[PDB]
Amino acid sequence: IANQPVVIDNGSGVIKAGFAGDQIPKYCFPNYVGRPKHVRVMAGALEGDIFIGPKAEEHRGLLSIRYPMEHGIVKDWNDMERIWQYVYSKEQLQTFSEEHPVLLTEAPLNPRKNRERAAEVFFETFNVPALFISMQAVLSLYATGRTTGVVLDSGDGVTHAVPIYEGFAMPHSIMRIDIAGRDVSRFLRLYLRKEGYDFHSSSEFEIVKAIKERACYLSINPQKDETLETEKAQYYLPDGSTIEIGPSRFRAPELLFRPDLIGEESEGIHEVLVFAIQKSDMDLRRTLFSNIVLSGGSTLFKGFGDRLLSEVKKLAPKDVKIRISAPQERLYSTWIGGSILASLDTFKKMWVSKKEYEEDGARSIHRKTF
Amino acid sequence: IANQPVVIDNGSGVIKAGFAGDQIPKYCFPNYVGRPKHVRVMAGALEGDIFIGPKAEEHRGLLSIRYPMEHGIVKDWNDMERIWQYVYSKEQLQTFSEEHPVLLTEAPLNPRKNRERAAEVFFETFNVPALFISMQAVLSLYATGRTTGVVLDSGDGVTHAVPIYEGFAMPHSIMRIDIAGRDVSRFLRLYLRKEGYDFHSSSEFEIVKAIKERACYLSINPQKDETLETEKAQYYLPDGSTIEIGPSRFRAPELLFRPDLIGEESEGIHEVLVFAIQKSDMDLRRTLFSNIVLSGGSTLFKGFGDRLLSEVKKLAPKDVKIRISAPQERLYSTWIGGSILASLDTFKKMWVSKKEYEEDGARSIHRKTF
Amino acid sequence: IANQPVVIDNGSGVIKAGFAGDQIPKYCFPNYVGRPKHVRVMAGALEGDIFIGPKAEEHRGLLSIRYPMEHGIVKDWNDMERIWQYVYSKEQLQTFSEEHPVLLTEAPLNPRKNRERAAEVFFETFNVPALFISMQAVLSLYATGRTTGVVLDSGDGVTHAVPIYEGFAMPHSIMRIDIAGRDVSRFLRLYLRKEGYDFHSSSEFEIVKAIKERACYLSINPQKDETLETEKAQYYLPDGSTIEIGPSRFRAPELLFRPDLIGEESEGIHEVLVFAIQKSDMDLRRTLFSNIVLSGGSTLFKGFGDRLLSEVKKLAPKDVKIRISAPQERLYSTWIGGSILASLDTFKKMWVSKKEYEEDGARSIHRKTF
Amino acid sequence: MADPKYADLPGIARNEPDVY
Numbered sequence A, B, C: 001i002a003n004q005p006v007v008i009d010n011g012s013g014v015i016k017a018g019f020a021g022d023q024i025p026k027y028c029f030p031n032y033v034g035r036p037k038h039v040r041v042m043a044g045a046l047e048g049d050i051f052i053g054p055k056a057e058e059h060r061g062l063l064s065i066r067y068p069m070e071h072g073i074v075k076d077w078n079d080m081e082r083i084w085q086y087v088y089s090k091e092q093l094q095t096f097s098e099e100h101p102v103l104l105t106e107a108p109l110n111p112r113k114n115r116e117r118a119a120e121v122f123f124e125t126f127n128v129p130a131l132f133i134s135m136q137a138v139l140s141l142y143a144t145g146r147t148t149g150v151v152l153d154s155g156d157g158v159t160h161a162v163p164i165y166e167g168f169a170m171p172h173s174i175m176r177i178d179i180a181g182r183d184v185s186r187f188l189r190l191y192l193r194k195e196g197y198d199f200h201s202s203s204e205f206e207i208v209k210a211i212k213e214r215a216c217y218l219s220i221n222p223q224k225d226e227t228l229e230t231e232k233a234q235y236y237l238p239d240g241s242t243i244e245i246g247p248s249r250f251r252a253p254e255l256l257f258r259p260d261l262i263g264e265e266s267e268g269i270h271e272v273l274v275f276a277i278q279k280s281d282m283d284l285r286r287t288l289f290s291n292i293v294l295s296g297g298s299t300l301f302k303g304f305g306d307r308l309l310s311e312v313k314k315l316a317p318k319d320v321k322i323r324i325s326a327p328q329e330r331l332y333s334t335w336i337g338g339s340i341l342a343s344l345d346t347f348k349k350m351w352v353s354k355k356e357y358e359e360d361g362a363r364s365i366h367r368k369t370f
Numbered sequence D: 001m002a003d004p005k006y007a008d009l010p011g012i013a014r015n016e017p018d019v020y
């Protein structure tokens, strides 16, 4: 039973889905399970009471949105099961879980208990013939067509750097922080309360993400922007009310480089990228500096790569050629590589079959991933 | 026992009744109990001494009229029991109370003691098999065919704006004010005494309602009409004596928008419509502005809808699509939706049965309405 | 110029005033401006046309009251200028603003624009020699004499919990809600209308506060109190008409614990207290649990601290010593600590002088507070 | 002490019992 396998790029913010050997993921929607805040009195209302995908994006104001997945660590399993059931349902894919093998994605250095429970869901609740969990950094390199390179990515949950050299991922040189898009949006929300405009509700949180996506830019010199007075640019909400954002728009994404602002003494994106290159072997460092691949959502800030370069110029050894490559399709780079990995003939050897899982269990899944 | 159920659209000014699945209510009559002032010396007179419906409208001058219901809250319960008995009697419906289920209507945010006392009357004095109390806003949307939209209504009793988005009524955004048609008619009478043509008797009060219905208009700019001098247009009374109305015609319905004139600091219709939309969540506000439904008799003033839009343009955020829709039969809006709701098969599940009331009591009625 | 400084404890509900180095504030009055509704035909009336303090409390019925501050955020700046002028005037303090340094108070995480405009008022309109702004939690701990303490406060506007440990206020562990005494009083008013007794005017609103202050208690188990039938206790108005309160007395303060009753998903008082301790560092949690201090007026409900213990026992880790402390003088705890802070010799270093304000501006005020 | 509002018999604090 070797049908066209399904690639599901998991993540805290957004969940991409689709079939192998496609150019772009056709089925992208945000990873959350909205449930109604108000009491349905009238008949002919929205049926079901559990809303995932575009219906949730259309009817945000009704639904109390809550995310099941934080920092690449699923908290609520019942919600993730309903999301994966929605992916496979007739509203999006129009296929059965029994036909196709699955390609799953997870962030590196996650809990092994979550990986086991992920496999239990796909093998037992859904009746998948073969599952395969893989890393995001390896898939991003598949999408670019490279073999060498450090992979700085920044989704909604996790920011991590994986140094890989000619198809040799170094697990001990991996760095990781739990400071990413969601924490930047949460830090922006807190700053807008200091400005004046509060967005306390859970549906109203999605407005802060929309402000962060559109109206934010990373300044090169933060001390110079702090001394100067801002212009206070405007932004229109979904209602119509105007909002002067002020200095919060540039100070909000600075969380990624300075994680002491939120109150969590970590490295930062630029330090993680240097640390990953430093922890790797001496002869590989110069090739790892030249090949740096960007990915995820929080790399799409304005002047992000300019600041990332300037930070590497500050930290790294002098007279060394830095190159921070960035594709066009940075959000879908992790999915595209999965679709490439799925299409290859080697894919049949990498996966965990259903029969193999029934015999061994979790140990076979831990062996095949690494 | 599932007979063709009775709809009783309750109201302070007018009461409308009939059966389920009918196009228009056949039995529309005013909600009051006229009792004779004068002594009956001569034989062959009007018998009964308690007049309801067309007999009371025909013989106004004899009868000391008194309304049992003020602001959707019955004070005189004995009179409402006599009205409901008159509805069921051979003079109007020609049916038994024991056969048919009842669809009663009440305004939102009323006293719960009146709701229990309403149920006691229908279950014990009349022997109803099944009763159901509903809201005026939900029924108006059933009549139109929509699910979305704010329902601004203004009868003789209450003015209230209930925001409902896709079959989800929000109970904490329901605005209400006791400033409706009866208070406008009372304010018109007080103005006509200032003009010269005073009225005092209860039969004579209904002439002021007839003046309010016919010869009144809401100006767009009230300050401009105040500076200009009126023409003093005429109106002929039921007797024959002419009355030059003057500025009392246009300043009377201004009470609905300016409740400071009668001497009671409340919101007003236009503020209630905006406040109900503003109390809801951010994403639903623009859809609630696009769908505004008018209802009741006090929305039928000349230039009322034009003034409502001007007030919404003033208060609401700029560059938003406003649309104040309405039915053709604005007085029969709530009844038609009830007749639709009654004829649905789900109506059997919604109601409070007689057996369920005898077991539980008031708690089961408070569990089924809201 | 170092005279005996003034301690203005701001707040939406009540404004306390007086001099430094005192046991209790001499000048306590509610924070609102009263202006007359009606016309003054007869001479020898109450002069001024603006009523603040005991005159406004005495003559409520005339005055259309309006609160300048909502949730520790002054909306009407002209009204607060009149109140602060009234505080300084001969009717209360009997002193000039030019002599004494000022100690101002604000809730944490407020708009910075309001803090700037507050400083502008005290430095420009009034001619203050030196101003200092402080937090509620730091002042509450000064009054008790502690350094370690989580300060769960609950005023009229804001509820929050700042976790301080040995003179180290953690700014990122601060949890805040805009649900407090005013919203509970507004929620009680809505229930009383559902019971039967309607209140609408601003003078009439303060009766609902007086009912909330007197006859309200927090049930230890709300589901048990729901299933049981209440006793329906009585209360006498200034008019003399009796009011059966019923279940609304115990259900009103449930807004503090369940903020889903008003229809606005927040954390709640008990969750804010736990979340503030959880957001702080690992080793500080057990000391923060042991030192939980209460303050503000909405902590004075009957069985509030008993229920707040039970909620902490439900949420927090098992076998930990919980101690919710609460002084005799909870209402004036914030003022007492300000008077103690003002009396100390370090106070001269912390403040912002008028000369320093004229040179730098708003930036110097933002630097000195944090 | 002097002033309008006080609470009589709440106690200063509510504490859980200390185990060994």
Ligand SMILES: Nc1ncnc2c1ncn2[C@@H]1O[C@H](COP(=O)(O)OP(=O)(O)O)[C@@H](O)[C@H]1O
Binding pocket: A010, A011, A012, A013, A014, A015, A154, A155, A156, A157, A158, A181, A182, A185, A209, A212, A213, A214, A295, A296, A297, A298, A299, A300, A301, A331
């Ligand atoms: N143009 C943008 N600029 C900055 N941040 C963005 C942009 N677009 C999306 N984001 C943020 O990044 C997230 C999307 O990144 P994604 O790679 O899908 O993360 P994950 O794979 O973990 O779901 C969104 O949740 C959003 O908060």
Ligand SMILES: Nc1ncnc2c1ncn2[C@@H]1O[C@H](COP(=O)(O)OP(=O)(O)O)[C@@H](O)[C@H]1O
Binding pocket: B010, B011, B012, B013, B014, B015, B154, B155, B156, B157, B158, B181, B182, B185, B209, B212, B213, B214, B295, B296, B297, B298, B299, B300, B301, B331
């Ligand atoms: N054409 C009209 N213009 C102005 N007011 C009207 C008009 N027709 C009726 N009214 C007023 O509105 C009331 C009818 O509204 P309705 O919603 O039926 O009241 P109820 O609360 O009794 O249901 C009447 O009592 C009358 O005072």
Ligand SMILES: Nc1ncnc2c1ncn2[C@@H]1O[C@H](COP(=O)(O)OP(=O)(O)O)[C@@H](O)[C@H]1O
Binding pocket: C010, C011, C012, C013, C014, C015, C154, C155, C156, C157, C158, C181, C182, C185, C209, C212, C213, C214, C295, C296, C297, C298, C300, C301, C331, D005
């Ligand atoms: N004994 C009491 N019981 C319940 N609530 C009270 C009591 N005393 C005061 N309150 C409430 O607390 C508020 C005053 O608290 P306070 O701490 O002075 O607020 P702020 O300092 O923000 O003005 C009042 O508005 C009142 O509603």
